[PDB]
A paper describes a structure:
Human [name] ([name]) is a homotetrameric protein involved in the transport in extracellular fluids of thyroxine (T4) and in the co-transport of vitamin A, by forming a macromolecular complex with plasma retinol-binding protein. The [name] monomer is composed of two four-stranded anti-parallel β-sheets and a short α-helix; two monomers are held together to form a very stable dimer through a net of H-bond interactions involving the two edge β-strands H and F, in such a way that a pseudo-continuous eight-stranded β-sandwich is generated, in which H and F β-strands from each monomer in the dimer are connected to each other by main-chain H-bonds and H-bonded water molecules. Structurally, the [name] tetramer is a dimer of dimers, in which the two dimers associate, interacting mostly through hydrophobic contacts between residues of the AB and GH loops. A long channel, coincident with one of the 2-fold symmetry axes, transverses the whole protein and harbors two T4 binding sites at the dimer-dimer interface.
An additional mutation (S117E) has been introduced here in the sequence of the double [name] mutant, to obtain a triple mutant, which is characterized by a stronger tendency to dissociate into the monomeric state in solution, in comparison with the double mutant. However, crystal packing in the presence of high protein concentration led to the formation of the [name] tetramer, whose structure has been determined. On the contrary, crystals of the structure presented here for the triple F87M/L110M/S117E [name] mutant belong to space group I222, where only one monomer is present in the asymmetric unit, and the tetramer is generated by the crystallographic symmetry. At variance with the structures obtained from crystals belonging to the space group P21212, in the centered I222 space group, the molecular symmetry of the protein is fully coincident with the crystallographic one. In both cases the tetramer generated by the crystallographic axes is equivalent to that of the already known structure of [name]. The triple F87M/L110M/S117E [name] mutant in solution is characterized by a high propensity to keep a monomeric state in solution, greater than that of the double F87M/L110M [name] mutant, even in the presence of the strong fibrillogenesis inhibitor tafamidis. The main reason for the pronounced tetramer destabilization could be due to the presence of the side chains of two pairs of Glu117, one towards the other, in the inner part of the cavity for each couple of subunits (A-A’ and B-B’). The distances between the two Oε1 and Oε2 of Glu117 residues of subunits A and A’ are in fact 5.15 Å and 5.06 Å, respectively, thereby generating a strong electrostatic repulsion, provided that they are negatively charged.
Numbering used by the authors:
A (entry chain A), B (entry chain A), C (entry chain A), D (entry chain A): 10 to 125
Amino acid sequence: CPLMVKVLDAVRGSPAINVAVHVFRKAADDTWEPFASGKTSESGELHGLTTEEEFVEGIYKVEIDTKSYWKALGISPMHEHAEVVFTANDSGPRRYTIAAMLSPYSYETTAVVTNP
Amino acid sequence: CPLMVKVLDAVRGSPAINVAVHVFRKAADDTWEPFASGKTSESGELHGLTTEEEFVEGIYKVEIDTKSYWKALGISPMHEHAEVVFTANDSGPRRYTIAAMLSPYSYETTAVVTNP
Amino acid sequence: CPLMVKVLDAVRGSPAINVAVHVFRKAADDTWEPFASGKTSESGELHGLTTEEEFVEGIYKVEIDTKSYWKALGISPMHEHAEVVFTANDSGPRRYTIAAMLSPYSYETTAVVTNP
Amino acid sequence: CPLMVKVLDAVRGSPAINVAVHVFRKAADDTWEPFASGKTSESGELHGLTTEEEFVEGIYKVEIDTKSYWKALGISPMHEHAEVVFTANDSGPRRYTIAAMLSPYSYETTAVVTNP
C-alpha cells in the first residue's frame, strides 16, 4: 500500500466511515488527471487505492468529500470539502498516509511518510 | 472587515509574515472568479481584503501559497499550498476569519465566524 | 502584554467566551505556584494576565478549564481540561500567545512567540 | 487492546519512534495513581498498555514525554510535555485511541473512541 487515507470525525471522536475520497494526478498538460478513488471503511481507513507500479512520481491531489458525510449525520458544514495537494516519490518511492481530522468548521491534514 | 486571514508558522511558533493569499468567488458558470488578494503583515494577519458591499453571498476559495514562504526560510515543503473553500453569508452577512497553521507536512485551517 | 491567551471553540467555529484560565509558575521547590488567572472576553481573548515586571523566566502552566464551558452549552466533554506547560523568557523576555482550539474530543494548543 | 497511544512527529511527517508514555489513574483520594507505561514502536504506536480486566472506569492521565524525543533529534522544544486527561468507560467499556501530533511549539491530541 503505497498510499493510504485515514479520516477522523474530530467532533464525535470516531473514525469517519464511508467518506468518499478521490485522488488525482497532475498531468503533463497542467490538468488534474483522475487517478483513484474509494470510500473509508469502518476504521476510517481507505486501503488499496493504488499499486507500487501505478503510483509514480508526481503531484497528487486528494479530495475528501466531507459535505455529504455530515449530511448523513444531520449537519450542514462550513467547508465544502477537504484537500491535500502534495508531491510524491520526488526522491524515490515512499509510503504515504494522508490523515484527515474533520469538523463542520476546522480541518487538519497531515502527510505521514515512511519507507519500505 | 468582513473577511480576515491569519497565518501561523506552526514549526517556528510565530506569525507567518508576507505570505501570499488569493481569494476567489465561485461564479454562476461554475468557475473560480478572482475576488481579492494580499500578503500577511508582520502579525501574520491580512486585513482589508474586501468590503461589506463587495463581500456578497457565495462560495469562496482562499488559496494560501505556502510553498514560496518555506523557500525564503530554506525549506522544501510537502504541501504545494493550503486551501479553505467555504460558503459565506449563507444566512445573512457575517465576519469571517480564516485561520491557518502551517508546517512542511501538516496544516490546520479554521473558519471562525462572528457577527457585527 | 507579555502573556495573552486565546481560546476558540472549534466545533462551533467561534471565540470561546468566558472560559476560565489559570496560570501557574513552577516554584524552586518543584511545586506549581499560582501566578495569574482570568476569563476570556467576547473575542475569546484574555489580556492583562501579568506585567513585564512580574513575568520572569520560568516554567509556566496554563490550565484552561474546558469542562464547565461545554456544560453552559449543554455538552459533556471527553477531556477534563486543557494544559500548556512551557518554558518562558529562557533567552530574554518574549511576548507569548498561548492559542487553544477546543472540542469535546480534540484540542490543539500552540505557543506563538514574538519580540517587542 | 482497550487503550492504544499513537504519536506523530508533525514537523517531519513521520511516526514518533520510542517516545515514553506514562498512564495514570485518578485514585479515590484525588491523587494520580500510576497505571501503565511504555514506549512507541517504529509505527509510532504503543500497544499492550493494559487489559480489559485492569482498565476500569475512571479519570486517566496520559503523559507523553516529548522533551527527550526532540533532544535525540537535536531540538530544544517549547512544551515540556503533552498530556491528555480524559474520563474512561463512563458508560460501559470502550476502546480508546489517544492520538498525538507533536511539534516544538504546537500539539494536537484526540481521543478516538469505538466499541468492540
